Amino acid sequence: RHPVVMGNWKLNGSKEMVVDLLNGLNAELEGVTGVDVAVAPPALFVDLAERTLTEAGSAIILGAQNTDLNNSGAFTGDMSPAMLKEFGATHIIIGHSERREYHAESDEFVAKKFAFLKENGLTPVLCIGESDAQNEAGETMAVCARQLDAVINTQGVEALEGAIIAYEPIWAIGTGKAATAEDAQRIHAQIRAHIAEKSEAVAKNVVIQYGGSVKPENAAAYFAQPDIDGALVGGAALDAKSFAAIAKAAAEAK
Amino acid sequence: RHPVVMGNWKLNGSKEMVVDLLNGLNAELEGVTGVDVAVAPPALFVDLAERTLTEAGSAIILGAQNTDLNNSGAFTGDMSPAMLKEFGATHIIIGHSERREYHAESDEFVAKKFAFLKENGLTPVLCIGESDAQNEAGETMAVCARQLDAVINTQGVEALEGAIIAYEPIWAIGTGKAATAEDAQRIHAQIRAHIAEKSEAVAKNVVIQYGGSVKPENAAAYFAQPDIDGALVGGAALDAKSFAAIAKAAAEAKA
């Protein structure tokens, strides 16, 4: 399993920053073989990202933060896989904890997105993860099993074929609570195992990134675990140094 | 009231298409000056749209098809008014029927976006409109007033100053009915009259666009009515010759 490190920029970007960051990023990662590095900028900046990376002749993968369920038509305001494809984007974050909470995206909704992306030749980065209370209640796997089965129990285990899964420890996050590399590995082993129950080939191959708070000096403690295959990075993704660091750590560590 | 004709491109666009459309459109509007022409492409193409319009020295206005409630922060996949301002996008469509239906956006949500747009210096194109069963049940004004009050009752009529309102007869859309310039004009005066009950000054100046199916053949019919101040165009927006025809008719109708 080749590690994959993705930067989720979220709702951050500007014309100056995008160029700076992507250039800095390219510099830092100059010849840093071993990992797959991807960026997910706001839709408004996918055009710029593409142009900047292409000039730079960069190897960074272009992604996007969500998708909708149609390629074209009377769908005012929607995100189209076919349109994203025109800019080279290929890694689409879906089910993120923020969309699920704020936009009330459901398991079935996110599963349809999963299927449509795959149908379009794109790579889904399916996010799963339990709340603070589902965690206090010791329901972590009930939840992760649930969110994952919405795909498996419809499309079938195979469907995770060439997809990335990202585990979000929503329970931690400024709430004084913290996930450790041990917690992370514990959990990632259970998820993989859940997949190994229907298919072991699939399970051993599926990249399962860790979505918790990972920093330059966390990174290798995490990338050491055998079931953690990369990271979906939040804040560190906004800094070329920090983010390249995390990418490097995973490259070697693996 | 100076007319505004906006093309909502919906889920339509491509690199080659965006530049051909904007270039032909700008060629067609050469002497035209009595109508504001705005264009709303998918977010993915707002940058390309800007680049094309700028190179051309075009006067066409850039807009977008939706917005969210934050400028920056932890909101994966959201739309930012501030990021939109960087590309020069000013007219922002909110409340469109396709979002109200497919994304279940409430009047409360839509109203929150209106206030945020005003907070950021942008122009909201507030869509309102009733369905088939409401129209048959003849509750057109209760629905429209309900939806306008969402912003009026929480922000004051003056909040409409500088905004654009687009009536969408959804009942006519996709369900065998048809609106006429005469039915349209009747609905716009009721809408204007509701706003006027709170402020005459605001009501006199607000641009209320017609959102039904407008086409180059039926446009002068609509722009002829005194309470129809432009159009929010869909399908006819995708062609430079059709969209420019609708813009021109509005220009003359209101000269």
One DSSP character per residue, chain B reads ---EEEEE--B---HHHHHHHHHHHHHHTSS--SSEEEEE--GGGHHHHHHHHHHHT--PEEEES---S-SSBS-TT---HHHHHHTT--EEEES-HHHHHHS---HHHHHHHHHHHHHHT-EEEEEE---HHHHHTT-HHHHHHHHHHHHHHHH-GGGGTT-EEEE--TTTTTSS----HHHHHHHHHHHHHHHHTT-HHHHHH-EEEE-S---TTTHHHHHHSTT--EEEESGGGG-HHHHHHHHHHHHHHT-
| Backbone φ, ψ for residue B52 (5° rounding) | -65, -50
Strands A61-64 and A36-40 turn out to be: parallel
Q: Give the chain A residue nearest B105 (alpha carbons).
A: A103
Q: What is the DSSP string of B24-48?
A: HHHHHTSS--SSEEEEE--GGGHHH
Q: What separation in angstroms does the CA of A80 have from each of A39, A168, A225?
A: 18, 25, 36
Listed in sequence order, the residues at least 6 apart from A17 whose beta carbon sits closer than 8 Å to its beta carbon are none
Whether residues A76 and B65 touch (CB distance < 8 A) is answered with yes
Helices A15-28, A240-253: crossing angle, 10 deg rounding? 30
Identify the active-site residue in B91, B96, B105, B130. B96
What chain A holds in terms of domains, given with CATH numbers, is: 1-254 (3.20.20.70)
Helices A181-196, A140-155: crossing angle, 10 deg rounding? 30
Structure resolution in Å?
Answer: 2.7
Q: Apex CA A214: angle with CA A1 and CA A253, to 5°?
A: 40
Residue B54: count other Cβ atoms within 10 Å of its Cβ. 12
* B168 annotated active-site: yes
Q: Is B197 exposed, middle or buried (0-12, 13-18, 19+ CB in 10 A)?
A: exposed
Q: What separation in angstroms does the CA of B223 have from each of A74, B40, B95, B194, B242?
A: 24, 21, 23, 21, 15
Catalytic residues of A: 96, 168
Which residues of B lie inside 8 Å of A (Cβ-Cβ)?
8, 10-15, 42-48, 65-66, 70-80, 83-84, 86-87, 93, 96-99, 102-103, 234
Q: Which two tokens stand for residue B219?
A: 């446009």
Q: Write the secondary structure of chain A as one string of H (helix), E (strand) and C (coil).
A: CCCEEEEECCECCCHHHHHHHHHHHHHHCCCCCCCEEEEECCHHHHHHHHHHHHHHCCCCEEEECCCCCCCCECCCCCCCHHHHHCCCCCEEEECCHHHHHHCCCCHHHHHHHHHHHHHCCCEEEEEECCCHHHHHCCCHHHHHHHHHHHHHHHHCHHHHCCCEEEECCCCCCCCCCCCCHHHHHHHHHHHHHHHHCCCHHHHHHCEEEECCCCCCCCHHHHCCCCCCCEEEECHHHHCHHHHHHHHHHHHHHC
Strands B164-167 and B123-128 turn out to be: parallel
Q: Is A96 exposed, middle or buried (0-12, 13-18, 19+ CB in 10 A)?
A: buried
Whether residues B98 and A80 touch (CB distance < 8 A) is answered with no
Q: Which of B94, B150, B95, B92 is nearest to B122 (CA)?
A: B92
Identify whether the C-beta of residue A46 lies closer than 8 Å to the C-beta of residue B6. Answer: no
d(CA A98, CA B177): 40
- A235 annotated as belonging to a binding site for a ligand: yes
Signed CA dihedral, B185, B188, B194, B199: sign only:
negative
Whether residues B11 and A98 touch (CB distance < 8 A) is answered with no
- B135 annotated as belonging to a binding site for a ligand: no
Whether residues B83 and A48 touch (CB distance < 8 A) is answered with no
Place of tokens 């799963």: A128
- The greatest distance separating any two alpha carbons of chain B, rounded to the nearest whole angstrom, comes to 51
d(CA B13, CA B32): 25
